Design a protein around this ligand. Structure first.
Ligand code: T6W
Ligand code: T6W
Ligand code: MG
Ligand code: MG
Ligand code: MG
Ligand code: MG
Ligand code: MG
Ligand code: MG
Lengths: 236, 5, 236, 5
């Protein structure tokens, strides 16, 4: 690793600087270096890791969607043949996206998940594993597409099982996991009813637990609850 | 697209 | 070059796709490949080249400013020493920025400028040469800082001399060159009076020539004239 | 920052 010679604390410091500078590729490289030091991550460090890769892959996904849309329009009736370039460039972006997903999944498998014993860390990493398999599923078309989808489902399901046993219904990680697994059901697994049921049950169980929270925790939980409601409004 | 975090 | 095996027309097509996908690093790499085919660039191709690198270096400059600001605050009185990391990371971004500038200047020198005979192409490339020396000047602190500044000035001045002889005062390249050379005077050369004089004279001479233009040319010219007025309002 | 194009 090109970060092997830099101190763990310096990598974390530079990840925070990269975030301030909106240099998310650098941020992700610094956090990958920090993970590869082999020590477990604190809550703030897990956040830095997730923010960095979410921004990198988010940009790739947006670009892939633009290119896929152009490619699909080129394959409609009456469209002038323009050669292999659109497919080639969509494939280039797709391959880079897959590489980033494989990198994140590799960090989770070697060895973040296996050392994560507390609910907050383990649920967080399993949510990430589901998310990055979900991004692989968005672009998948081959023999392994069903296995990629089931890998996302399996990671999300293990995270859900732990979160329901070990976290309150307002815990922001539990809420964000449910939000994303609901989107998985709607956009990946062709299961809109399950998506809607999960979002509604999650929202209602969080609502009933808000009374236990401080003002600051209430703000965190209600923010994610509003995203659940936003999706429900989009879907109904 | 729907919201994810 | 990694683009050496791709057709010139395919590189241009992919540059346009990259622009639509907001993948400006890819766009710049495709356009660099196209330049390196050795043929002159059309007006649209010159635009693609400039848009790609302007976006790449613009992002680097924004990040450099964020990091330089943090570094300066760390060097104030009462600031807790936090080690070399801020300087190191600012230097990393700075070195990448310098590399992009050197790449663009290299394309202009080998061999875009020397083959550019028409005013529209030659002024455009000399403006670019001034711009990229200006970006080098923004970060320069060493023995060669004055020479970097004079390199920007010299390129802008040759472009101005050609543009005044060969282009109408409303020509958008002539206007954009004057806008940027004015900013050079204000922000690089410590010459705010020259910056203001140039912006005002450029604006007034364009205003007197608008009557010759079609509706579409009028729109292009007045857009840049408004930027001149915006700077004048900022500076007075 | 001032405007450039
Ligand atoms: S991890 C990024 C920092 N975010 C937070 O600490 C808060 C609590 C504001 O929001 C979170 C935390 C965790 C998750 N998650 O799905 O794991 C989502 C959100 Cl919005
Ligand atoms: S080169 C990018 C495309 N822009 C244009 O064609 C118009 C005429 C709209 O605007 C231009 C053209 C040239 C320059 N320039 O400074 O060389 C600036 C602008 Cl805004
Ligand atoms: Mg150490
Ligand atoms: Mg593929
Ligand atoms: Mg259920
Ligand atoms: Mg050829
Ligand atoms: Mg330096
Ligand atoms: Mg004069």
């Amino acid at each position: 690793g090109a970060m092997g010679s830099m101190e763990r604390a310096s990598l974390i410091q530079k990840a925070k600087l990269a975030e301030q500078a909106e240099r998310y590729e650098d941020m992700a490289a610094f956090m990958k270096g920090a993970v590869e030091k082999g020590e477990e991550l604190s809550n703030e460090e897990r956040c830095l890791l997730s923010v960095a890769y979410k921004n990198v892959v988010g940009g790739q996904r947006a670009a892939w969607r633009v290119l896929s849309s152009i490619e699909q329009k080129s394959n409609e009736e009456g469209s002038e043949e323009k050669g292999p370039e659109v497919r080639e460039y969509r494939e280039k972006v797709e391959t880079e996206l897959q590489g980033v997903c494989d990198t994140v999944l590799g960090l989770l498998d070697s060895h973040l998940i296996k050392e994560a014993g507390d609910a907050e860390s383990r649920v967080f990493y399993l949510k990430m594993k589901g998310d990055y398999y979900r991004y692989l599923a968005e672009v998948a078309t081959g023999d392994d597409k069903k296995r990629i989808i089931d890998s996302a489902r399996s990671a999300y399901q293990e995270a859900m099982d732990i979160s329901k046993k070990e976290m309150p219904p307002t815990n922001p990680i539990r809420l964000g996991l449910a939000l994303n697994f609901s989107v998985f059901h709607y956009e990946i697994a062709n299961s809109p009813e399950e998506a809607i049921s999960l979002a509604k049950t999650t929202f209602d169980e969080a609502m009933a637990d808000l009374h236990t929270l401080s003002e600051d925790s209430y703000k965190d939980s209600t923010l994610i609850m509003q995203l659940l409601r936003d999706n429900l409004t989009l879907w109904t | 697209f729907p919201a994810t975090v």
